[PDB]
């Protein structure tokens, strides 16, 4: 009778450089290193990080990253070009939950 409907999410290898990280990270250096070790020997055991995928007023794609901080840090320390990310389609109102009056008028 019924179906489940929701926002589109898709896992991709996303260049680290395109992830916008507005806020500072709180990091346990031990956990970053444990993650670096895991990524090196068993990357499949490290899930994709969740990323807001926002399309702006004129169709620009923007990728906002808030969580996944330890994984993000670990991929940076490995000088990786990309990171596995679950791109979750999100609206500017979704973004405003994080950014409030600082939310950009994305184009
Ligand atoms: N060696 C490891 N150390 C920590 N987490 C690991 C490790 N290997 C795999 N994982 C997995 O990676 C994910 C890490 O998520 P977690 O929420 O702990 O940190 P984060 O999201 O990267 O950073 P934060 O939550 O601080 O923003 C979890 O799914 C965990 O099971
Ligand atoms: Mg987390």
mmCIF file of C-alpha atoms in Angstrom, residues 4-107:
data_model
loop_
_atom_site.group_PDB
_atom_site.id
_atom_site.type_symbol
_atom_site.label_atom_id
_atom_site.label_comp_id
_atom_site.label_asym_id
_atom_site.label_seq_id
_atom_site.Cartn_x
_atom_site.Cartn_y
_atom_site.Cartn_z
ATOM 1 C CA UNK A 4 9.033 5.339 2.082
ATOM 2 C CA UNK A 5 10.029 8.713 0.672
ATOM 3 C CA UNK A 6 12.993 10.806 1.735
ATOM 4 C CA UNK A 7 15.926 12.920 0.712
ATOM 5 C CA UNK A 8 18.444 11.471 -1.757
ATOM 6 C CA UNK A 9 21.768 10.275 -0.308
ATOM 7 C CA UNK A 10 24.550 8.689 -2.297
ATOM 8 C CA UNK A 11 28.055 7.563 -1.393
ATOM 9 C CA UNK A 12 30.894 9.035 -3.498
ATOM 10 C CA UNK A 13 34.650 9.540 -3.293
ATOM 11 C CA UNK A 14 34.660 13.291 -2.780
ATOM 12 C CA UNK A 15 37.809 15.428 -3.066
ATOM 13 C CA UNK A 16 38.693 16.659 0.408
ATOM 14 C CA UNK A 17 39.252 20.100 -1.152
ATOM 15 C CA UNK A 18 35.560 20.586 -2.037
ATOM 16 C CA UNK A 19 34.327 20.006 1.550
ATOM 17 C CA UNK A 20 33.453 23.320 3.249
ATOM 18 C CA UNK A 21 34.155 23.010 7.013
ATOM 19 C CA UNK A 22 32.773 26.153 8.706
ATOM 20 C CA UNK A 23 33.379 25.040 12.296
ATOM 21 C CA UNK A 24 36.461 23.938 14.248
ATOM 22 C CA UNK A 25 36.940 20.253 15.070
ATOM 23 C CA UNK A 26 37.320 18.692 18.530
ATOM 24 C CA UNK A 27 39.880 15.892 18.116
ATOM 25 C CA UNK A 28 41.347 13.183 20.282
ATOM 26 C CA UNK A 29 44.849 12.787 18.814
ATOM 27 C CA UNK A 30 44.819 9.052 19.767
ATOM 28 C CA UNK A 31 41.576 8.502 17.825
ATOM 29 C CA UNK A 32 42.901 10.321 14.771
ATOM 30 C CA UNK A 33 45.975 8.027 14.767
ATOM 31 C CA UNK A 34 43.860 4.877 15.325
ATOM 32 C CA UNK A 35 41.805 5.941 12.304
ATOM 33 C CA UNK A 36 44.946 6.572 10.196
ATOM 34 C CA UNK A 37 46.084 3.023 11.031
ATOM 35 C CA UNK A 38 42.616 1.578 10.178
ATOM 36 C CA UNK A 39 42.342 3.483 6.888
ATOM 37 C CA UNK A 40 45.790 2.065 5.929
ATOM 38 C CA UNK A 41 45.035 -1.636 6.754
ATOM 39 C CA UNK A 42 41.261 -1.949 6.547
ATOM 40 C CA UNK A 43 39.620 1.099 4.811
ATOM 41 C CA UNK A 44 36.265 -0.730 4.287
ATOM 42 C CA UNK A 45 35.754 -0.734 8.040
ATOM 43 C CA UNK A 46 35.692 3.094 8.007
ATOM 44 C CA UNK A 47 32.252 4.311 6.981
ATOM 45 C CA UNK A 48 31.629 7.307 4.743
ATOM 46 C CA UNK A 49 31.343 10.676 6.403
ATOM 47 C CA UNK A 50 28.003 12.446 6.155
ATOM 48 C CA UNK A 51 28.036 15.614 3.996
ATOM 49 C CA UNK A 52 25.241 18.117 3.244
ATOM 50 C CA UNK A 53 24.857 18.498 -0.513
ATOM 51 C CA UNK A 54 23.133 21.810 -1.194
ATOM 52 C CA UNK A 55 22.199 23.110 -4.647
ATOM 53 C CA UNK A 56 22.188 26.913 -4.714
ATOM 54 C CA UNK A 57 19.734 29.355 -6.394
ATOM 55 C CA UNK A 58 21.527 29.036 -9.723
ATOM 56 C CA UNK A 59 22.287 25.356 -9.465
ATOM 57 C CA UNK A 60 25.783 25.444 -7.885
ATOM 58 C CA UNK A 61 26.650 22.317 -5.873
ATOM 59 C CA UNK A 62 28.048 22.980 -2.368
ATOM 60 C CA UNK A 63 29.301 20.360 0.011
ATOM 61 C CA UNK A 64 29.114 21.225 3.733
ATOM 62 C CA UNK A 65 30.882 19.031 6.260
ATOM 63 C CA UNK A 66 30.253 19.258 10.061
ATOM 64 C CA UNK A 67 30.646 15.807 11.515
ATOM 65 C CA UNK A 68 33.038 13.031 10.652
ATOM 66 C CA UNK A 69 35.826 15.146 12.099
ATOM 67 C CA UNK A 70 38.164 12.387 13.151
ATOM 68 C CA UNK A 71 37.870 10.610 9.804
ATOM 69 C CA UNK A 72 38.328 13.912 7.984
ATOM 70 C CA UNK A 73 41.469 14.675 10.031
ATOM 71 C CA UNK A 74 42.834 11.154 9.399
ATOM 72 C CA UNK A 75 42.348 11.400 5.627
ATOM 73 C CA UNK A 76 44.139 14.800 5.709
ATOM 74 C CA UNK A 77 47.114 13.309 7.619
ATOM 75 C CA UNK A 78 47.322 10.649 4.887
ATOM 76 C CA UNK A 79 47.369 13.412 2.173
ATOM 77 C CA UNK A 80 44.472 11.671 0.425
ATOM 78 C CA UNK A 81 42.895 13.371 -2.583
ATOM 79 C CA UNK A 82 39.419 11.982 -1.762
ATOM 80 C CA UNK A 83 37.391 10.655 1.129
ATOM 81 C CA UNK A 84 34.312 8.383 1.070
ATOM 82 C CA UNK A 85 31.329 10.645 1.833
ATOM 83 C CA UNK A 86 27.578 10.054 1.915
ATOM 84 C CA UNK A 87 26.261 13.112 0.088
ATOM 85 C CA UNK A 88 22.890 13.898 1.661
ATOM 86 C CA UNK A 89 20.711 16.287 -0.349
ATOM 87 C CA UNK A 90 19.906 19.212 1.916
ATOM 88 C CA UNK A 91 18.236 22.658 1.637
ATOM 89 C CA UNK A 92 19.437 26.084 2.764
ATOM 90 C CA UNK A 93 16.974 25.715 5.695
ATOM 91 C CA UNK A 94 18.786 22.524 6.644
ATOM 92 C CA UNK A 95 22.086 24.437 6.500
ATOM 93 C CA UNK A 96 20.664 27.213 8.684
ATOM 94 C CA UNK A 97 20.178 24.685 11.467
ATOM 95 C CA UNK A 98 24.009 24.791 11.704
ATOM 96 C CA UNK A 99 24.844 28.288 10.519
ATOM 97 C CA UNK A 100 21.896 30.470 11.656
ATOM 98 C CA UNK A 101 22.219 34.154 10.598
ATOM 99 C CA UNK A 102 25.585 33.226 8.993
ATOM 100 C CA UNK A 103 23.852 31.008 6.394
ATOM 101 C CA UNK A 104 25.053 32.088 2.876
ATOM 102 C CA UNK A 105 22.738 32.888 -0.018
ATOM 103 C CA UNK A 106 24.278 30.081 -2.115
ATOM 104 C CA UNK A 107 24.132 30.408 -5.905
#
